[PDB]
Amino acid sequence: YVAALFFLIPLVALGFAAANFAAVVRKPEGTERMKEISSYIRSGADSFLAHETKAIFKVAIVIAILLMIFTTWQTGVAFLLGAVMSASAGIVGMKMATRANVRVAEAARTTKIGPALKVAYQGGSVMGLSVGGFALLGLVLVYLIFGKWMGQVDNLNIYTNWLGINFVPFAMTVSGYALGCSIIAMFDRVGGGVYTKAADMAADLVGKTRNPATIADNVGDNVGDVAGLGADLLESFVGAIVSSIILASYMFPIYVQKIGENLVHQVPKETIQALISYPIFFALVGLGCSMLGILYVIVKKPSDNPQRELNISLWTSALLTVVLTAFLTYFYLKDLQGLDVLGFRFGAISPWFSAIIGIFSGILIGFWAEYYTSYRYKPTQFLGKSSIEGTGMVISNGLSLGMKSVFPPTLTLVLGILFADYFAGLYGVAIAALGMLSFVATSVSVDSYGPIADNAGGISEMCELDPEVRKITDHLDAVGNTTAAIGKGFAIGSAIFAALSLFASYMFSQISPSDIGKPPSLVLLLNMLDARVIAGALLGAAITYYFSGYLISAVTKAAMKMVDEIRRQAREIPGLLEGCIEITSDNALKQMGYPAFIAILTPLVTGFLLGAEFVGGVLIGTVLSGAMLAILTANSGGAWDNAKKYLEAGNLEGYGKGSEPHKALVIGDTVGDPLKDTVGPSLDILIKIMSVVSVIAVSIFKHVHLF
Template sequence: MEVLLVLVIVAALLALGYAAFNFASVKKMDEGNARMSEIAEAIRVGANAFITYEYKIIAVVVAIIAVAFAVIFSLQSSTFMWQPSVCFVIGTVMSACAGWVGMKIATYANVRVANAANKTRNIGETLKVALKGGSVMGLCVGGFALLGLFIVYIVFGMLLGLLDITALTTGGHIFTQCLSCYALGCSIVAMFNRVGGGIYTKAADMGADLVGKTEAHIPEDDPRNPATIADNVGDNVGDVAGLGSDLLESYVGAITSSIILAVSLFLSNIASSGAASENMLQKMMYYPLVFAAIGLVACILGIAYVLLKKATDNPHKDLNISTWAAAAITVIGGLVVTYLMFGKAGAADMAFAKFNAGWLSPWIAATLGVVSGVIIGAIAEYYTSYDYRPTQIIAQASKEGPALTITQGLAVGMKSCMYPLIVLGITTYASYAVSGMFGIAMAAVGMLSFVSATVSVDTYGPISDNAGGIAEMSELDSDVRNITDKLDSVGNTTAAIGKGFAIGSASLAALSLMVSFLYAFQPEGSTLDLNFTDPKILAGALVGAALPYLFSGMLIEAVANAARKMVEEVRRQFKEIPGILEGKAKPDYKTCIEISSQGALKEMRVPAILSILFPLVCGFLFGPYFVGGLLIGATLSAIMLAIFTGNAGGAWDNGKKYIESGAIEGQGKGSPAHDAAVVGDTVGDPLKDTVGPSLDILIKIMSTVSLVAAVLFRDYNLLDWIMKMM
């Protein structure tokens, strides 16, 4: 089995090598005129300053948690256990590297996309530059994630002997704790990047829109608006670095949950029947990694095909080709690998693994994940693209004012929840039917197996958005802005699709992590259940269902607080600096960047830390069953809230762009309908870019923290202590 790890490291190095090649080729391109270079440099400096300071905060948090893990695990096992802490640090490093590289390439690619649009006046050629920049982020997500897992397997699994059957079956289960802590490290960075970056970008965006477009009636990204540079900085730290860390965390969470579940099933079989197939366990522990490696290679091929083929004038079609090609190659390659690994397994092995459809079982489950991901993406596209009726209705409602714009957007967002949840329900049931709980975990792996392609497509959006801002501030021809606006509009839809993938896979991964959590604290061989007639479980579920709303409210309030300061600053500059609106004086961009940075760094701490501490506090107070209910309630609530916020926000944004495209006769930029649409877009901004993306991280980080501390909840909780005293 160990030879299969060669495929994993080859795929990771190929992805990182191709990312480096694309990074270098983008950087060699011309930035354009001096004004464009000046603006791009200002954006670059602001993004670097913010993420550097944010990473310093993350480093402090990581150091504290790593030390705490070493102490807690050592006390629990009566021996010094440093391995989980080191794996936790490796996870943070991999996720931080992906976010950093993605942010860097975005700040180089934005101006080059604007220059490509200016020189070629061709949307297809401009798309290639944006996608090449986005591909660096996408390939780094898959590459760094698998590189870190490879290190954990080689160093801790093989060199330190933690993958040995004896080590797996005797106290502590150190290897699964190492995997959990690696995933948690990725989650910590994702939470801070998504929350911090999301607050930053939306505070700047809302401040720029509310004063610039709505009050002063100047165009979006107009150089007279002091908040424009901060807005463009926010695209890079929130929509690129945050996005990359977010989906890397989802990717790792799906893979590790399936591996941990395989070990849990093995130990449960030994406890209940006294026998289990060690060979089958090894295959099940390697299969998710190998399937993900196949998917990463497929992504390289899918991205390369679009970049090398002749450009077209249909960016949506080209981007879909990249994603669909990667998905198709993953499914075909996965079938071959599945046969090679499980094709000759005996009936006893199939029974142990609960492979009810024979050797095809895990492939069917993974393929169900792939298909459901594509369907959920298509549903998100229907509800957010202005090519379809829901968004067009929002745009039409804007003619009646902002109240109906917001009302119609809320209706679209709420209605959009039903079909994705039906797809997830069918996928969950069908994957369980063919392959048990391992099948549900593999459905999550399948859904994210071509994550590098989806992230590449997703990242191209904020790069194009930045390019439009640079074009506007550099006063390039309107034709250039038209090209970047078209790319940005498609980017809003691809972003909604990416969010659908993230929350869909999060729900499946959280479910498998929850089962592993039950295995972790219940006696081995016992029946696993969460009986909702148990008041502790029911109470936990009720509290858990409310938690995503508390978390979301804190994030929206954080954005509002930071945006309020931005609005005050922009108004002050318009009032106190004569000649700004006439274009005779230069705005103070630096102060606006500082306001967004300080606001984001201040406001992000409580929501981010809450996601870590809440399950810990509940577990030590009320025990593991309360936490089990908490996870169920939070997962169900967060899935629907994330879909609602992501799709409603995307529809509001594209409704505004539908009006700007001139599709509604007599309406356009500066019209009352456009003003109403801007209000809707502003309301949707923190929903789609801060709340929605953070919710999938919330449920996975809570599940992972709970899994790591499950035994401690069982042995040390206040409620049990009080009951024993009575």
């Protein structure tokens, strides 16, 4: 076996990707104009992937060596597995996305809206199924090879390496895996995010110096919401599972009591081992459920409403997972012992209640993102309508909106944390994070749908293929845009929940051989009353604000550098001949190290200067600040965009376009775009990677710091 059965799920997911690829690839594209536009963007995507991958390779090697020297070789391998695993997923989804777009638009005419959705969604699913299969294939490998074969799940005492750096082997191994996933996420957001909006600015910046720099912007849409959103969600997914494993693993040395000079493990090996393996199996059942959710919607009789379709896959994947999960939990944790001490209030079933809380939190966090972002509800409506009072008002109201929009989703996270932890303690928080993300394949599938449609729509526009064809196309895109704001919203929620599990992980990972005496409560402690901790927290909040400010300026730097590649193309051409991607792609990368140094090196520097408490502080400031700003920037940016739309759909009598309010709404959307698509999504990654790195380096700086 029953267990191998589970362990081969990721393989079917991967083959399933391979099949959806096939079945889409065998779909056709129409006109030479339809093919030509696709290749523009498809080649455009490859160029960017090429340059980015090479940069990723260079950093991954250096990190791998470093891990191998300072921790253990297993950890460095695990790191590479994760880097290869997430890398692979992005590379596959993008290849799909940039080929499915043409075949959506042709679906919209050759077929005649439902069978165009059936195409788009099959495409979207290649990114989602690859995200699940790869991420879980990797963890299965690490569990099987380093955990079982090499016995890291059999020993799991506190190991001390050739430099006297001490850690629990498996905990450390999977921490490396997580770092691998993080680094490709970081590159995809802080690098690809700059590119994407650098393109959008540049395109949206014409004084007459179609088809000028549109293709860069069109690739951006895939870079951002296929690859970027996918890497983001992947990291949070692995982060949640890895954290469950790290807390479980360390529970072994924590729950020992000396009795007559024996060390008695109050939570025993069987329990720890099950608790380590459980989240993997939990996530596997999820993938199986998500495959059923995805396949169902593809094979299903078609609809006229693609939102309901996309949603049927989501709801289906989640109902399914809740049900099977409760059996998995009862049967898998039926007789373990020490679950009381472990934090399980209702014995065995406890963490399932936690997973469920996370699931519902995720969905609610989705609803809130829609609520604050969709004309259709009040906040955006109001924003939209205030346009008649001017650009200042539009800006001030949008800032006001997003600042307020932070409360409902956060209350939802607060209640989720409280309840998660009521059922199953800190382990329960991480399992809730995992439940929140348990149907990640389907979540990611609906995300990737957005750009496929967006390109499909634009391709219709560039080609000017009919109006009747264009109607289905605009609708598909319209739905992309809603599901995309829900998507960003859900991915910020999951980033916060994952980061908070990784913070629990950071503290658990500090247990030393010399603590095995002490009470759990003296070892599982970060005291906020400590000045180092207060300082840490302040430093981390400010670093997060800096990071965000820097990324805005980065986007505007790169855009402008492109305009000039345009300007030198248009100064070159019109004089003689009437009237890229790599350039801005290269500058996006160049202007990335700096953010990446902040993300990766901040724990290291502050850790080696001031130690584990201060870094504990830093991680807390970072998550608190980052959680809030991520939400503010998503919502403000979304609201501003959908407000512009609102008037464009003619919901303000007598204004509908190039009018003074429309202009004011355009200016808000231009301020908003870098916030929603670059700042917020980068912060998701910052609040995670900074934690993973810390989890690993606290091996060294608990003991070896300067002051």
